[PDB]
Design a protein around this ligand. Structure first.
Ligand SMILES: Nc1ncnc2c1ncn2[C@@H]1O[C@H](COP(=O)(O)OP(=O)(O)OP(=O)(O)O)[C@@H](O)[C@H]1O
Ligand SMILES: [Mg+2]
Lengths: 41, 102, 396
């Protein structure tokens, strides 16, 4: 209330949009194996 | 509520208007109050228990174990006037807190 | 429009009793209700909106909710605020109002023109919305008021209009308790007949209780009958004139912007922690950061009232007193009295020690009269409660 290294709001919006449009990842084999074992447990 | 005062004012004005008087009078206001009081009616529910309840609650609040306190109550109220002790115990049993208003 | 006005309002501000003068000048036709008038003054002068970056919006509006049993002048308070405040719009929870809470789009009955009729929340974007009968609102009205209070925006997606228009109003609401009689046995939330999210967005919660108090009844009757007599058609500081009060409000809202650089963070944090501890020491509603933010808003409002441009410790104390009084009244009797006794230090601030003694005497005589009315005060009790030392001033 008195005062009134990160990313500002507009830059964060643009970065999120760009990441969504550009990158769609997939799990790797080892990652899937570990996830499966942890899910079973 | 103050709405009742406003209605009383209106009724007194109506009495003055009926009598063609340019200024309301004690008789007019008295009639208006009488009419309002008679119009308001007493609720009847299935009656002196509330008096005992509020007096004992007031005594407790002023004071602010059952063995001592029940007898304390059974003795205190009888300081101004043999058959009513059982009635007092009955009402106490029926009652038998932090959140309570008189 | 303010040249000699602005010349004189600064002197009025330096008067050094301007806060009390304003609090007494609000609602000259309403007897008593000093706490309500003080809260309304704070709401009228408002707080200071802020937004760290562009991502943490915090309102600067002091919302007020007068919940009271019938015959307590809540409607008169709302009407006076309508008369005084600029950009003040009166809407009702019923359907008998010129404006409504919810925005729609239709061809106007008179203009015959396709118009986006924004709600009474938007017609007071930078003003006050006076919502009477706040407890009797439709589902859509409740949702609209929730959206306005929590977001200060109204979203239309109606015909082809997909818009979000700002409504940054200060909400002054009037409500009645469940059953038409406030019961302190229960808490305010379960007395008011409103949702907890709706209640939370109110900075001040005035519980306008009505009790049969001889002196108060006599004085109120005197006031009402005198008003009738003087308005018959065949015809302790002095309140400010209403126009001067209006111009004072204009200047205070337009120019002075209080800042919070000098406020005892240590003291306020200690108060907040103590309030939390006492809140869960009993079975009551806990205090939250919402309350400290509302206290900050009220401190800014008091600083604006006094044109200080900086919140002074007295302003902070008065804001704390308002916030406490409200939060305490929101509690049940069991916890209300306990918290009042525990935090009487804060509640007693800016009290000349005569009002406290008068209230103690009034409660003692009320206990005595309720005792007598059913069955059919000593200096010691008064001195004991005073100890809980000087009674010559009170007597004289
Ligand atoms: N404190 C008061 N001082 C002077 N007049 C008062 C006061 N309280 C109520 N009145 C008057 O008494 C009547 C009741 O007030 P009003 O109609 O505003 O009630 P209310 O609080 O709006 O009630 P409700 O919530 O039941 O609608 C009105 O004539 C009002 O002018
Ligand atoms: Mg009303």
């Amino acid at each position: 209330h008195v005062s009134a290294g990160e990313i500002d709001l507009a830059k964060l919006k643009k970065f999120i949009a760009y990441c969504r449009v550009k990158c769609g990842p997939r799990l790797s084999a080892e990652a899937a194996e570990k996830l499966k074992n942890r899910y079973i447990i | 509520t103050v709405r009742q005062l406003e209605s009383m004012i209106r009724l007194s004005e109506a009495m003055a208007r009926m009598h063609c008087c340019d200024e309301v009078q004690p008789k007019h206001v008295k009639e208006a109050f009488r009419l309002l009081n008679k119009s308001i009616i007493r609720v009847e529910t299935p009656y002196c228990r509330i008096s005992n309840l509020i007096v004992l609650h007031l005594r407790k609040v002023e004071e602010e174990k059952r063995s001592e306190l029940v007898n304390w109550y059974l003795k205190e109220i009888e300081s101004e006037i043999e058959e009513e002790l059982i009635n007092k115990k009955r009402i106490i049993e029926k009652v038998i807190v932090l959140i309570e208003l008189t | 429009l303010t040249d000699e006005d602005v010349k004189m309002i600064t002197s009025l501000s330096k008067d050094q009793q301007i806060g009390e003068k304003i609090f007494a000048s609000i609602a000259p036709s309403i007897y008593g209700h000093e706490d309500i008038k003080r809260g309304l003054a704070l709401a009228l002068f408002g707080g200071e909106p802020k937004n760290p970056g562009g991502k943490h919006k915090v309102r600067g509006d002091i919302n007020v909710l007068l919940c009271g049993d019938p015959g307590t002048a809540k409607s008169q308070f709302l009407k006076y605020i309508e008369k005084v405040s600029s950009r003040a719009i009166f809407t009702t929870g019923q359907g008998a109002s010129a404006v409504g809470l919810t925005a729609y789009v239709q061809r106007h009955p008179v203009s015959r023109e396709w118009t986006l009729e924004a709600g009474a929340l938007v017609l007071a974007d930078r003003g006050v919305c006076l919502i009477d009968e706040f407890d009797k609102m439709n589902d859509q009205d409740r949702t609209s008021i929730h959206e306005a209070m929590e977001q200060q925006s109204i979203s239309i997606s109606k015909a082809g209009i997909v818009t979000s228009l700002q409504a940054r109003c200060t909400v002054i609401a009037a409500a009645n308790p469940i059953g038409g009689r406030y019961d302190p046995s229960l808490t305010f939330s379960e007395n008011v007949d409103l949702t907890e999210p709706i209640i939370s967005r109110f900075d001040i919660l005035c519980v306008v209780r009505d009790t049969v108090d001889p002196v108060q009844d006599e004085m109120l009757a005197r006031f009402v009958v005198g008003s009738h007599v003087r308005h018959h058609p065949s015809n302790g500081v002095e309140p400010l004139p209403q126009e001067v009060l209006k111009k004072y409000i204009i200047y205070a809202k337009e120019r002075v912007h209080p800042k919070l650089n000098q406020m005892d963070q240590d003291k306020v944090a200690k108060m907040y922690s103590d309030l939390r501890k006492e809140s869960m020491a009993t079975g009551s509603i806990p205090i939250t950061v919402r309350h400290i933010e509302s206290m900050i808003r009220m401190a800014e409002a008091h600083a604006r009232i006094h044109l200080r441009d900086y919140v002074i410790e007295d302003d902070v104390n008065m804001a704390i007193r308002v916030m406490l009084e409200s939060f305490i009244d929101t509690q049940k009797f069991s916890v209300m009295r306990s918290m009042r006794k525990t935090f009487a230090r804060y509640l007693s601030f800016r009290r000349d020690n005569n009002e406290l003694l008068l209230f103690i005497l009034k409660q003692l005589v009320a206990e005595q009269v309720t005792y007598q009315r059913n069955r059919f005060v000593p200096e010691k009790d008064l001195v004991d409660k005073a100890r809980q030392h000087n009674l010559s001033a009170f007597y004289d």
